[PDB]
Design a binder for this molecule. Structure first.
Ligand code: COA
Ligand code: PRX
Length: 633
């Protein structure tokens, strides 16, 4: 049944159950008053007058918030805190090696961001230019992002785990002018060859836009160097002035791109602007994590993903929080690592992923052995569904039965939390995201777009805009309309399925499109198919997800070879390595199913549902039996 709000939370919560109901209803009935007042969570250089100005209508998808106002994201995350809180830790950095760590005051963070901003400008970088950031979990990644935002440059963070080919792709689509990386990343006592990956990516003859590469000496390893192109981070920043006066950006000036896998084609750059995004990130962070000054906060998400943008850096810093940046993996060297970090830094709010929770739970009490955990007050979960027994293990083992768990459902296209508990306001059901946040109107529709009311299930749509909504796909607004606003007209389609129970709670069941969730990573099946088919021995491929006790879904690839070609264990490894090279280790098929029996319709279209069910272990009609025999082997 429900978990009641505990008294300690009741005594402190910013939002109680009555306040939730009042605010939500105003957020929907009168969003201009509600967000007009709520926008004051930030400092504006010139105040807005218009608040909500959005349309989801066919041929007129247009989203604007606070449009006539100006601000600077770097000033809201840094400058404004300096006067009263400049000595406060903005970022606690915990190294993969626990003997290495740092506390970085707001004043120290501000200074390096000013220096790096001048560094960028001196390099000929201007407002509107795209800057690729391919960084490990080090504070210099945050410096780079915040300095881009300060000067109105549009950063494009590329997750460090992508391959040279995945990196080149992103640089080409975005016309990145600059690449910011490190000699090597460090993760689980191991090096990641980031700069060398950059070298390989930049040899792709279709990469034409890049003028420099800035390189942080993280490990001091021997690397190759291209004179003139390659610049050391330290060389540049030490010669830069610490004085930088921030200019006003418009609320709708582009802030960042994030490449996101979709149901069809290669990943596209989900674009966020400035005002609405930052208002929404700060508002959701504060209310949902019940942030009180002095609260130590740790989100485990990588900087390379939206969770890392909104809830490691932007939400927290705007709010004047201490946010923890962990360099490593929550279970290395031992499964107790995560909770040792909590004890070490007296962390009060912990926000992580179900895959991580499941990985720790497999280790049982080894995940908590020798650790206290008493500083914790709030837990959270993001990225994927969480089953009740993982939710209960997390709530009992990590939170000592004392901490509410906020299961936050949202996406890269939403900027911030969409459906989530608030810890002082909403009683928890293990596995449920619960109720919509302020300004969020979910609905469920069937495949024909018919709204489904009460306790039912359907396709999860949002029926109006909210301040943190992505504004477009980089260079392709028509695709943006087509992808999200064309299936169910006048509505934003999330691509997820959900049920709503008799209490009005949402239970997110997962993607209903051809998108996979693998270790809490969003990947398209079509893009893995392309990677595979690009192999010179492969003619066809069909990728499906299957359940996996830790990963959530594993990648199961049915593969048809060019005629005359034979399978082998050599070829098996080689085809996995092939995808590892095309995209990255994150997209590596778990299973390869060699077949000549791909099930096609009368018009040659792949019957995915049957592949899915067969892989899950349970025209030319004969193919099913051959597929089942093969699967059995
Ligand atoms: C559970 C988890 C901690 C396990 O991590 P893991 O032990 O490294 O295993 P993963 O499946 O994640 O990674 C697979 C590979 O990618 C590599 N990798 C992972 N993150 C990397 C990074 N940041 N940079 C470079 N390589 C990375 C690993 O080293 C591994 O490589 P290998 O096969 O050569 O050994 C991790 O998958 C995780 O935190 N996922 C949740 C995602 C999330 O945070 N959700 C919300 C984000 S929006
Ligand atoms: C939120 C950070 C992840 O952003 P991405 O844009 O990479 O992925 C969004 C998708 O992750 C799943 N998802 C995310 N959170 C949840 C969640 N809390 N419960 C169930 N599924 C979730 C949903 O399917 C969603 O469409």
């Amino acid at each position: 049944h429900k978990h009641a709000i505990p008294a300690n939370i009741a005594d402190r919560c910013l939002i109680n159950p009555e306040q939730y109901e009042t605010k939500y209803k105003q957020s929907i009935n009168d969003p201009d008053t509600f967000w007009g007042e709520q926008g004051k969570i930030l400092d504006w250089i010139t105040p807005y007058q218009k608040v909500k100005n959005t349309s989801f209508a066919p041929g007129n998808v247009s989203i604007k918030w606070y449009e006539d106002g100006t601000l600077n994201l770097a000033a809201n995350c840094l400058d404004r805190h300096l006067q009263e809180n400049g000595d406060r830790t903005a970022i606690i950095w915990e190294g993969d090696d626990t003997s290495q760590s740092k506390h970085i005051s707001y004043r120290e963070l501000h200074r390096d961001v000013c220096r790096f901003a001048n560094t960028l400008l001196d390099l000929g970088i201007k407002k509107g230019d795209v800057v690729a950031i391919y960084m490990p979990m080090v504070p210099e990644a945050a410096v780079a992002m915040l300095a881009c935002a300060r000067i109105g440059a549009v950063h494009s963070v590329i997750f460090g785990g992508f391959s040279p080919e995945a990196v080149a792709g992103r640089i080409i689509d975005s016309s990145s002018r600059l690449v910011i990386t490190a000699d090597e990343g460090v993760r689980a006592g191991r090096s990641i060859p980031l700069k060398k990956n950059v070298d390989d990516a930049l040899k792709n003859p279709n990469v034409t836009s890049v003028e420099h590469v800035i390189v942080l000496k993280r490990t001091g390893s021997d690397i190759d160097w291209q004179e003139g192109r390659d610049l050391w981070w330290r060389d540049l920043i030490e010669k830069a002035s610490p004085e930088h006066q921030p200019e006003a950006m418009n609320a709708e000036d582009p802030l960042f791109i994030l490449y996101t896998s979709g149901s069809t084609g290669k990943p596209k750059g989900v674009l966020h602007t400035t005002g609405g995004y930052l208002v929404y990130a700060a508002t959701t962070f504060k209310y949902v994590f019940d942030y009180h000054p002095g609260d130590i906060y740790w989100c485990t998400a990588d900087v390379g993903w939206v969770t890392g943008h909104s809830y490691l850096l932007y939400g927290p810093l705007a709010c004047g929080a201490t946010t923890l940046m962990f360099e490593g993996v929550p279970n290395w060297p031992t499964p107790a690592r995560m909770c040792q970090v909590v004890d070490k830094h007296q962390v009060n709010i912990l926000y992580t992923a179900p895959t991580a929770i499941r990985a720790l739970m497999a280790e049982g009490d080894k995940a908590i052995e020798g650790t206290d955990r008493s500083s914790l007050r709030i837990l959270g979960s993001v990225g994927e569904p969480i089953n009740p027994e993982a939710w209960e293990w997390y709530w009992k083992k990590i939170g000592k039965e004392k901490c509410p768990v906020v299961d936050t459902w949202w996406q890269t296209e939403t900027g911030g939390f969409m459906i989530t508990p608030l810890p002082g306001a909403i009683e928890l059901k293990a596995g449920s995201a619960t109720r919509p946040f302020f300004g969020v109107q979910p609905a469920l529709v069937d495949n024909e777009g018919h709204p489904q009311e009460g306790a039912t299930e359907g396709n999860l749509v949002i029926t109006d805009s909210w301040p943190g909504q992505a504004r477009t796909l980089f260079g392709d607004h028509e695709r943006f309309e087509q992808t999200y606003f064309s299936t169910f007209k006048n509505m934003y389609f999330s691509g997820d399925g959900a049920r709503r129970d008799e209490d009005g709670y949402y239970w997110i069941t997962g993607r209903v499109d051809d998108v996979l969730n693998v270790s809490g990573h969003r990947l398209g099946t079509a893009e893995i198919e392309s990677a595979l088919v690009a192999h010179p021995k492969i003619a066809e491929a069909a990728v499906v997800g299957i359940p996996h006790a830790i990963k959530g879904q594993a990648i199961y690839a049915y593969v048809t070879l060019n005629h005359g070609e034979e399978p082998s264990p050599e070829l098996y490894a080689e085809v996995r390595n092939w995808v590892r090279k095309e995209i990255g280790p994150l997209a590596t098929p778990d299973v390869l199913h060699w077949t000549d029996s791909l099930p096609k319709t009368r018009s040659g279209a792949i019957m995915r549902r049957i592949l899915r069910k067969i892989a899950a272990g349970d025209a030319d009609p004969g193919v099913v039996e051959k597929l089942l025999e093969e699967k059995q082997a």
